[PDB]
A paper describes a structure:
PI31 has a globular N terminus (FP domain, residues 1–151) and a natively disordered, proline/glycine-rich C terminus (residues 152–271) that is necessary and sufficient for proteasome inhibition. We determined the cryo-EM structure of a mammalian PI31–20S proteasome complex after incubating recombinant human PI31 (hPI31) with the purified latent bovine 20S proteasome featuring a predominately closed-gate conformation. After model building, extra densities were identified as C-terminal domain residues (aa 189–253) of hPI31 located in the interior of the 20S particle. Portions of two hPI31 C-terminal domains were identified within a given 20S particle and featured the same C2 symmetry characteristic of the β-subunit rings. The modeled structure is shown as a linearized hPI31 chain extending from the vicinity of the β5 active site of one β-ring and then crossing the interface of the two β-rings toward the β2 and β1 active sites of the opposing β-ring. At the β5 active site, the dipeptide Asp197-Leu198 and residues 208 to 214 of hPI31 fit into the β5 binding pocket in a parallel direction with the Met208(P1) and Ile209(P3) inserting into the S1 and S3 binding pockets. Specifically, the antiparallel hydrogen bonding between Gly194-Gly195-Glu196 and Gly206-Gly207 creates a conformation that fits into the β5 binding site. At the β2 active site, residues 242 to 246 of hPI31 occupy the β2 pocket in an antiparallel direction with Asp244 (P1) and Arg242 (P3) inserting into the S1 and S3 binding pockets, respectively. The hydrogen bond between functional carboxyl oxygen (OD1) of Asp244 of hPI31 and the hydrogen of the hydroxyl group (HG1) of Thr1 may impede the deprotonation of HG1 from the gamma oxygen (OG1) of Thr1 by Lys33 and prevent the formation of the threonine nucleophile. In addition, the unique antiparallel conformation formed by Gly194-Gly195-Glu196 and Gly206-Gly207 of PI31 forces Asp197 to sit at the S1′ site and residues 208 to 214 to bind to β5 pocket in a parallel direction, which is in the reverse direction of normal substrate binding.
The 20S proteasome (aka Core Particle) is a 28-subunit protease complex composed of four axially stacked heteroheptameric rings. Each of the two identical outer rings contains seven unique α-type subunits, whereas each of the two identical inner rings contains seven unique β-type subunits, resulting in an α1-7/β1-7/β1-7/α1-7 cylindrical architecture. The β1, β2, and β5 subunits of each inner ring harbor N-terminal threonine residues that line the central interior chamber of the cylinder and function as catalytic nucleophiles for peptide bond hydrolysis with, respectively, different substrate specificities. Substrate access to these structurally sequestered catalytic sites occurs via gated pores in the center of the α-subunit rings.
Numbering used by the authors:
A (entry chain A): 1 to 245
B (entry chain B): 1 to 233
C (entry chain F): 4 to 241
D (entry chain D): 2 to 244
E (entry chain G): 6 to 246
F (entry chain E): 6 to 241
G (entry chain J): 2 to 205
H (entry chain C): 2 to 251
């Protein structure tokens, strides 16, 4: 029951430690930060924005294939943080779950339902000892007819929740503090204000001035519920608007 | 890729005759958020604390108090995803009972089935026991019920009980304050006071979740009603 | 250490020790030599006897009319592999009414032997084969390993003390191609004799010869059919 | 779905699980079986007498069919499982062959079952040894003994369980063609063999008797005490012949 | 201690060491490179000749996954052959189901998911090989993808896998491949392979070259003998000064 | 200590640990001798009785696989029971399918194909968890004349002119090397086998301490009776 | 055709505070009588009864399986079953064999425990329940039973009038059926007692 | 996979099954269950280990479970394993009734549950059930019976036995005080009360800490009933009166 106590194989498989913890899940949480990237999601009154940093170390790498933004359905987009192959497997699972939900129930899956399904699968990974949990974090973005923009994040522990703003990656603590400060000083957030808030959060937690090719922005709005990825021209316009002021 | 699991039990007896995995699951439960259940004369109140680590969370998106049927409600202490799994299984079991008998499941039968599932996970191969204790309330045959199911698969019928952090102090407080013939509103007041006994910080209508069960059925209390009760306290 | 007991455990050096142990199992067997000319493929195997009153163990097996193999390593694994190859050849002749190409059979063997090296609780096949075949592409000599890797060889030797045989084959590979059947068999016999100590000599008891060619089905010469091939072999040059 | 190899070879060529099953047999109560000309006698020691226990429920001697009966030493529950399987096999053989089983056939079935449990994935060997007695169709008395490893042999007299070595030595020193001339002599020999390791003088002895074309008969404590008194009388006769 | 024995176990730092050990096994293999140009993809493999008794073309590390898709591998050759079989099955199933040739990105994603499926359990072992996929079509152009043992798949303009991939990457970076054609890219690949090979460490090697593009009409095939000899002569004369 | 490794792990020397341990287990069995002559095959095994209350006639270390094949076993006899049953079933299946008798080599091969069929993972329920602990001496007469075969849990099987298995297989084999010759008769083979058994056995050789069986061209498998054994042991 | 193999007739009637269940006693194969005391009404509780008409083997099988499930339910729940719950259980049991149907049409009569409200219902062979307020009939002579019951039934009958009505209906209905009869047994279920009577009937 | 296996169904070097012994230790840590067989009936007397002022009143009984119309059982050990085993016992009894249309004899039911226990102790790789059971019942063959089963799968018939906490002292008391063939249900109840009083030495005897159930035959029917609080209070009062009389007379 003491802090840091270990017994048997509690460090190697997902069984309880004397304190009642699961160390493998925490190790998967550290595997999330092993990727080295950071992503920020912010919810507006009529929009929702995900911004993640795009690192292409070498020119031999085709930049159009290094994407951490994925679309699950026409109206749902996601940003993945952590291990790349785990993130791609989870994206494929989410796409399958959404397609199956539409086939079986006759209407598009809500963002909360998809996050709940992914969290259930990751919980199953956390309870059975024969398989590794996924070292990836998923943030979902979409528009609900009744409630509006939705920001949902699920973790390897099986936990999921909705957010006004959230972050994931190496600098998620600093980004969450910055977003706490921004949200506490509550004021009307249009689409432009939400995009600038996310971009400036990423820039200030990374302490680097951004170029349009160094980040990746995806948005959903009430007017256009389809998930889309901003091109370099639109990101450049947003960056210029940020830099002038 | 291989879809086979481990076929040997991960919970085994110790030289002293104890299943230490169950005790560690109980420790995980005891490290969870406080939960209180009080059986009144005309109903049951389930109360718990839900304080997010940040204001960025959406308080209205995830519910710790969940309905199983129109007359049965749930609340937990411990690990949230395990609670979600058990809620799904409890709802499925209740729906199967209704499909078979065409009458709503009694609270005791649902408690027995959920405890059977928890025992299955405590004995089967390649899995760990659930890290949650459940507080199950219900109204059957014009009578209220309150049950607690632990990670080992054992269940108890309670007049009033507490789970999670400072649950011994909460139990002593309930012993001091609980009495029979209690009305539902007084039970809600006592549950909120029990939560306040260990609550750290300021308790608002969003920091706590309250669910009530009576003859009309089980329902979650809206934040406005919780605010009214807090102002009345 | 802790990395040498399971086939599914990588080592910090990027190696799997169980596969290397199975390769050692192959190296424990008696030496056999395979070599080919433009028209024939020949397997010569050095048979071993457990005792003076025991018959020498079979080393060359029939697979099909155009394919034969020589084994080195675990004999039960060799029999399992030979049965699998025989079934594959029979299926090929049943479905397409043509002999199965040797390279495709060797690919099937490699695919079959790779699976146990990646699953928990399985073990690598502890046998190495020299495959002699003839098809539309001509004669072929193939070597398989417990690592599930296979090689297309002009000549090859596997088993105990096969390095000297490999050196002799390296020396005479330039003339292996234009030799006739008798010359090729004598070259193989000399290579096999290179694996033997000085006090030991090739005789009709411990020599097995397998030959396949353009107009010749796969045939095994064991005891008295070996003497014509043994006749003419000069004394050991020392 | 459990497929672990439990019984495996040791570096010295030993199956440790089988040896431990034999050790578990060595801790069981002593069971004695002696073959006679017209009778077969099975005697089992009671480790303790509780005075509060229904003796009918803890009998170590049971009948597998109308002609075959067995005793055991070791784990009682494993013995119960083995006995049930042997009874089912006896009924199946009476069905398909239309003839009652022989002692050797059911002994072979039991031994094969034990050997199967010594060489199958995910299970441990049985921890019992059995003394199978009976009469064949021609009327020949039979006595067989199985062990956890799955090997069986025919015997004239044998003892399993704890203290089996000393009882077997006593049987070797005492089993003669003139010691089994009459049924009472065989019964007294079995009781004397059991008395070499047990206390209370016959009070801790469960004795059974099977005769040619007769059902298995269990001696009541009165008959056992009468036989023990007769054995004491013969001891006094040896005393008087000494002096 | 003991955190590096299973692919289903995380290390305290948050690492899966079995996958890293498989990648180490890949790093011990010879170098294979692939360069994407404006009209196709060219593969070049430094195939080490371990024994002079082996036939020419033995242990080939270039595969035809489909009519339009080529594969260059590095690492364990049996694992690479199994992955080539998996890719062939995926392409055949795609053609059977949807009635047309599989896009290279989709095939790379499927094979990468299959590879990633072996990095999660203790019952299996991660693949000890990494490989490149190249293809060309009129509608899609030239595409080049690489898959590592962890299951990560990226598109590349020029990729190198094996013992000497950093030096090979440095050599490739000096090439303006976005405007070059397969005819010049073949010679450049041959020159890079001859540059990065270690004569002192390795006795000898064969130069295995293949390409897919407009010059091959969208088919992956071994570079013809004439072009291969010209490229080898150019590489040897470039090594000399 | 015995569960550190699986049943199918190689040693650094290229040997499966369990197979080597079974080979070691063989050396604890009683000695068995088979001699093949042009007139037939003779098998002789030490019964190794432990107690006089035991009935030696219940020990069956020589069995009849078929009318023309006999088997002598050493090691763990309970393990040899299933192999013997498989051999008998194979011979009967071959007779059913082809209306002819099996050759001794084919029977030995069929039995040896079961030796390595053990393992934990990828195994049906009821599969073998370990190798067998028996060495089998197969002696029979087929169209190729009398033949003697030896099988061990490694799955290897060879033809033998004269071989010994069991605890005293080293000393007996050296004795077999001297006495045996190609022109040996069946009576000479039986006498030499009994002489070597008497030399290697702790107890004195008699009609109940040993088993002896012969297979000859034109005669079925024949196990010697007590009077025949008494006649043979009369003068050695 | 299969239902008429063995004959039989079961009837249930509702009183003011009581229920009545009646059945014929003949057991026969086609046109041959075997016994005259076949049991078709089975107690499912203190004040709960089920009557089964149809194949005699299916009658016995359904009664035994229902007793199995009811004993398990009462051991687990720790209470007596309600007649509506028993009807649902029988419907589930019959629908489990939807493609292999039992050839029985159960009739359930009883008083609700703790309320003693009369309950009657009938089900088809695959488990479709039909809860009525006056009477339910089942067997080979359903038309005659329907005529008799529709003519004679009255609301709020006392147990004596209910007994007379159900007895006359069953007697006159089985007097007009070839494969039904050989006696009639009537159970009257009250709150405080149960009366079982065998009627003086024709034996031809 | 092999590294994490506990090998719960393997022998020890001394021929012992460690998991079974540890489950028996778990039994020894449980609450006392007592069973006494009389001439006119058989009773169970369990100690209520689930005591708290905030606990609700039990539905039927905390530790005594009805198995069929003629049998009842009491459990000591892990509670949820006991629930599983009691459900299985009820299933077995109902299956026998379905097959034969007669109530199952008690020993057959005990044998079936013990076969399940032995199957768990022999193969499967699962931990054994940590429950010991006491069985009481009546059948047409042997009348009133009392059985006890172990987690190992071993069972046996008894005239008086105890399981759980301080079971050895209770066994000694029953050995000293039980009279074979002379016991009535009243004397059996008095003996049960005195044994529970002496064994539960740490806590003074009260009707809220013990549960008593009796099994009698009433005109061809088996009656399994649980004694009410007033009845147990009267039993305890009679025991205390007898103890005070003995103290005065000594």
């Amino acid at each position: 029951m003491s802090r840091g106590s270990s017994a048997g194989f509690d460090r190697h498989i997902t069984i309880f430690s004397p304190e009642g913890r699961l160390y493998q899940v925490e190790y998967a949480f550290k595997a999330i930060n092993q990727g080295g990237l950071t992503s920020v999601a912010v919810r507006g009154k009529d929009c929702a924005v995900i911004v993640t940093q795009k690192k292409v170390p070498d020119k031999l790498l085709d930049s159009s294939t290094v994407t951490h933004l994925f679309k699950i359905t026409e109206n749902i987009g996601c940003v993945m943080t952590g291990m790349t192959a785990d993130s791609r497997s989870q994206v494929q699972r989410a796409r399958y779950e959404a397609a199956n939900w539409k086939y079986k129930y006759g209407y598009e899956i809500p963002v909360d339902m998809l996050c709940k399904r992914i969290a259930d699968i990751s919980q199953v990974y956390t309870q059975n000892a024969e398989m590794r949990p996924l070292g990836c974090c998923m943030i979902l973005i979409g528009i609900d007819e009744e409630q509006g923009p939705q920001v949902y994040k699920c973790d390897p522990a099986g936990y999921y929740c909705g957010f006004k703003a959230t972050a994931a990656g190496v600098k998620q603590t600093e980004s969450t503090s910055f977003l706490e400060k921004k949200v506490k000083k509550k004021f009307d957030w249009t689409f432009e204000q939400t995009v600038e808030t996310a971009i400036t959060c990423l820039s200030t937690v990374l302490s680097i001035d951004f170029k349009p090719s160094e980040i990746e922005v995806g948005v959903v709005t009430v007017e256009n519920p389809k998930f889309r990825i901003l091109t370099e021209a639109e990101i450049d316009a947003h960056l210029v608007a940020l830099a002038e002021r | 890729m291989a879809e086979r699991g481990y076929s040997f039990s991960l919970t085994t007896f110790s030289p002293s005759g104890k299943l230490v995995q169950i005790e560690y699951a109980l420790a995980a439960v005891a490290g969870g958020a406080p939960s209180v259940g009080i059986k009144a004369a005309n109903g049951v109140v389930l109360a718990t604390e839900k304080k997010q680590k940040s204001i960025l969370y959406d308080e209205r998106s995830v519910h710790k108090v969940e309905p199983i049927t129109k007359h049965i409600g749930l609340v937990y202490s411990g690990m949230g995803p395990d609670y979600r799994v058990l809620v799904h299984r409890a709802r499925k079991l209740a729906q199967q009972y209704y499909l078979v008998y065409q009458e709503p499941i009694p609270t005791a039968q649902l408690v027995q089935r959920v405890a059977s599932v928890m025992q299955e996970y405590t004995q089967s191969g390649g899995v760990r026991p659930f890290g949650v204790s459940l507080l199950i309330c219900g109204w059957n045959e014009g009578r209220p019920y309150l049950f607690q199911s632990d990670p080992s698969g054992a269940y108890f019928a309670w007049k009033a009980t507490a789970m999670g952090k400072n649950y011994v102090n909460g139990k002593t407080f309930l012993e001091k304050r609980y009495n029979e013939d209690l009305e539902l509103e007084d039970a809600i007041h006592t549950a909120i006071l029990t939560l306040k006994e260990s609550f750290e910080g300021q308790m608002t209508e969003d920091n706590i979740e309250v669910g009530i069960c009576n003859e009309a059925g089980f329902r979650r209390l809206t934040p406005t009603e919780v605010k009214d009760y807090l102002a009345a306290i | 250490n802790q990395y040498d007991n399971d086939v599914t455990v990588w080592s910090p050096q990027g190696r799997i020790h169980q596969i290397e142990y199975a390769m050692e199992a192959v190296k424990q067997g008696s030496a056999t030599v395979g070599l080919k000319s433009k028209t024939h493929a020949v397997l010569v195997a050095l048979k071993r006897a457990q005792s003076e009153l025991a018959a020498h163990q079979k080393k060359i097996l029939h697979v099909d009319n155009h394919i034969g193999i020589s084994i080195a390593g675990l004999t039960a694994d060799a029999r399992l592999l030979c049965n699998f190859m025989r079934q594959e050849c029979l299926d090929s002749r049943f479905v397409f009414d043509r002999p199965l190409p040797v390279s495709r059979l060797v690919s099937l063997i490699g695919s079959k032997t790779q699976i146990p090296t990646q699953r928990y609780g399985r073990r690598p096949y502890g046998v190495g084969l020299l495959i002699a075949g003839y098809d539309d592409m001509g004669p072929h000599i193939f070597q398989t390993c417990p690592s599930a890797n296979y090689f297309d060889c002009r000549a090859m030797s596997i088993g105990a003390r096969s390095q000297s045989a490999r050196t002799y084959l390296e020396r005479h590979m330039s003339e292996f191609m234009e030799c006739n059947l008798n010359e090729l068999v004598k070259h193989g016999l000399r290579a096999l004799r290179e694996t033997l100590p000085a006090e030991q000599d090739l005789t009709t008891k411990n020599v097995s010869i397998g030959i396949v060619g353009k107009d010749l089905e796969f045939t095994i010469y064991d005891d008295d059919d070996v003497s014509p091939f043994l006749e003419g072999l000069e004394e050991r040059p020392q | 779905s459990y497929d672990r190899a439990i019984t495996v070879f040791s570096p010295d060529g030993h199956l440790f699980q089988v040896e431990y099953a034999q050790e578990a047999v060595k801790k069981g109560s002593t069971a004695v079986g002696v073959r006679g000309k017209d009778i077969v006698v099975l005697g089992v020691e009671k480790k303790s007498v509780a005075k509060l226990q229904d003796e009918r429920t803890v009998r170590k001697i049971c009948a597998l069919d109308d002609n075959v009966c067995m005793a055991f030493a070791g784990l009682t529950a494993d013995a119960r499982i083995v006995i049930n399987r042997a009874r089912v096999e006896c009924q199946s053989h009476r069905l398909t062959v239309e003839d009652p089983v022989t002692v050797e056939y059911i002994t072979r079935y039991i031994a094969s079952l034990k050997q199967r449990y010594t060489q199958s994935n995910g299970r441990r060997p049985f921890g019992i040894s059995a003394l199978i007695v009976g009469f064949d169709f021609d009327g020949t008395p039979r006595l067989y003994q199985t062990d956890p490893s799955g090997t069986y042999h025919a015997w004239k007299a044998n003892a399993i369980g704890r203290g089996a070595k000393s009882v077997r030595e006593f049987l070797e020193k005492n089993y003669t063609d003139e010691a089994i001339e009459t049924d009472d002599l065989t019964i007294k020999l079995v009781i004397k063999a059991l008395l070499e390791v047990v206390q209370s003088g016959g009070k801790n002895i469960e004795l059974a008797v099977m005769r040619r074309d007769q059902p298995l008969k269990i001696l009541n404590p009165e008959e056992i005490e009468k036989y023990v008194a007769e054995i004491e009388k013969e001891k006094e006769e040896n005393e008087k012949k000494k002096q | 201690t003991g955190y590096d024995l299973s692919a289903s176990t995380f290390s305290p730092d948050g690492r899966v060491f079995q996958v890293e050990y498989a990648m180490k096994a890949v790093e011990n293999s010879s170098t294979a490179i692939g360069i994407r140009c404006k009209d196709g993809v060219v593969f070049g493999v430094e195939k080490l000749v371990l024994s002079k008794l082996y036939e020419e073309g033995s242990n080939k590390r270039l595969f035809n996954v489909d009519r339009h898709v080529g594969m260059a591998v590095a690492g364990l050759l049996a694992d690479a052959r199994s992955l080539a079989d998996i890719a062939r099955e995926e392409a055949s199933n795609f053609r059977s189901n949807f009635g047309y040739n599989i896009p290279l990105k989709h095939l790379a994603d499927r094979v990468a998911m299959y590879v990633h499926a072996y990095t999660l359990y203790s019952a299996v072992r991660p693949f000890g090989c990494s490989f490149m996929l190249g293809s060309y079509s009129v509608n899609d152009g030239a595409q080049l993808y690489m898959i590592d043992p962890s299951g990560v798949s990226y598109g590349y303009w020029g990729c190198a896998i094996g013992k000497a991939r950093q030096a090979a990457k440095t050599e490739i970076e000096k090439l303006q491949m976005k405007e070059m054609t397969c005819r010049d890219v073949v010679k450049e690949v041959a020159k890079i392979i001859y540059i990065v090979h270690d004569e002192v460490k390795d006795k000898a090697f064969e130069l295995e070259l293949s390409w897919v593009g407009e010059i091959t009409n969208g088919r992956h095939e071994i570079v013809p003998k004439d072009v291969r000899e010209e490229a080898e002569k150019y590489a040897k004369e470039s090594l000399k000064e | 200590s015995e569960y550190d490794r699986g049943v199918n792990t190689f040693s650094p020397e290229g040997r499966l640990f369990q197979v080597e341990y079974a080979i070691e287990a063989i050396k604890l069995g009683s000695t068995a001798i088979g001699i093949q002559t042009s007139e037939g095959v003779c098998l002789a095994v030490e019964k190794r009785i432990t107690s006089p209350l035991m009935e030696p006639s219940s020990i069956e270390k020589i069995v009849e696989i078929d009318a023309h094949i006999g088997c002598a076993m050493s090691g763990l006899i309970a393990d040899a029971k299933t192999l013997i049953d498989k051999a008998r079933v194979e011979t009967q299946n071959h007779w059913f399918t082809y209306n002819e008798t099996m050759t001794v080599e084919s029977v030995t091969q069929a039995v040896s194909n079961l030796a390595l069929q053990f393992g934990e993972e990828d195994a049906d329920p009821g599969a073998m968890s370990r190798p067998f602990g028996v060495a089998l001496l197969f002696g029979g007469v087929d169209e190729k004349g009398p033949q003697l075969f030896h099988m061990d849990p490694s799955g290897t099987f060879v033809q033998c002119d004269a071989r010994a298995i069991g605890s005293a297989s080293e000393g007996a084999q050296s004795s077999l090397q001297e006495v045996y010759h190609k022109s040996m008769t069946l009576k000479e083979a039986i006498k030499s086998s009994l002489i070597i058994l008497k030399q290697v056995m702790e107890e004195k050789l008699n009609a109940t301490n040993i088993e002896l069986a012969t297979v000859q061209p034109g005669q079925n498998f024949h196990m010697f009776t007590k009077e025949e054994l008494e006649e043979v042991i009369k003068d050695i | 055709s299969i239902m008429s193999y063995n004959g039989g007739a079961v009837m249930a009637m509702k009183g003011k505070n009581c229920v009545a269940i009646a059945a014929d006693r003949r057991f026969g194969i086609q046109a041959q009588m075997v016994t005259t005391d076949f049991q078709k009404i089975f107690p499912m509780g203190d004040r709960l009864y089920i009557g089964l008409a149809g194949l005699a083997t299916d009658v016995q099988t359904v009664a035994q399986r229902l007793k199995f499930r009811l004993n398990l339910y009462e051991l687990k729940e720790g209470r007596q079953i309600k007649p509506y719950t028993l009807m649902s259980m029988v419907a589930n049991l019959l629908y489990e064999k939807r493609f292999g149907p039992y050839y029985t049409e159960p009739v359930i009569a009883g008083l609700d425990p703790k309320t003693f409200k009369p309950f009657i219902c009938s089900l088809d062979l695959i488990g479709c329940p039909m809860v009525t307020d006056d009477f339910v009939v089942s067997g080979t002579c359903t038309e005659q039973m329907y005529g008799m019951c529709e003519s004679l039934w009255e609301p709020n009958m006392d147990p004596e009038h209910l007994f007379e009505t159900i007895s006359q209906a069953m007697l006159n209905a089985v007097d007009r059926d070839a494969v039904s009869g050989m006696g009639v047994i009537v159970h009257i279920i009250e709150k405080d007692k149960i009366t079982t009577r065998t009627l003086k009937a024709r034996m031809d | 996979s092999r590294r994490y296996d506990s090998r719960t169904t393997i022998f020890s070097p001394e021929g012992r099954l460690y998991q079974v012994e540890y489950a028996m230790e778990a039994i020894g840590h449980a609450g006392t269950c007592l069973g006494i067989l009389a001439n006119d009936g058989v009773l169970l007397a369990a100690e209520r280990r689930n005591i708290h002022k905030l606990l609700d009143e039990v539905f039927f009984s905390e530790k005594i479970y009805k198995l069929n119309e003629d049998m009842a059982c009491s459990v000591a050990g892990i509670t949820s394993d006991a629930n599983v085993l009691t459900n299985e016992l009820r299933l077995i009894a109902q299956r026998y009734l379905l097959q034969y249309q007669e109530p199952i004899p008690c020993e057959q039911l005990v044998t079936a549950l013990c076969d399940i226990k032995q199957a768990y102790t022999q193969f499967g790789g699962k931990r054994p059930f940590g429950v010991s059971l006491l069985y009481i019942g009546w059948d047409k063959h042997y009348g009133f019976q009392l059985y006890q089963s172990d987690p190992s799968g071993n069972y046996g018939g008894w005239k008086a036995t105890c399981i759980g906490n301080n079971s050895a002292a209770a066994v000694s008391m029953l050995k000293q005080d039980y009279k074979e063939g002379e016991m009535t249900l009243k004397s059996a109840l008095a003996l049960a009360i005195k044994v529970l009083n002496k064994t539960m030495d740490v806590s003074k005897l009260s009707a809220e800490k013990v549960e008593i159930a009796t099994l009698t035959r009433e005109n061809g029917k088996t009656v399994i009933r649980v004694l009410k609080q007033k009845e147990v209070e009267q039993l305890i009062k009679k025991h205390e009166e007898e103890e005070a009389k003995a103290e005065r007379e000594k």
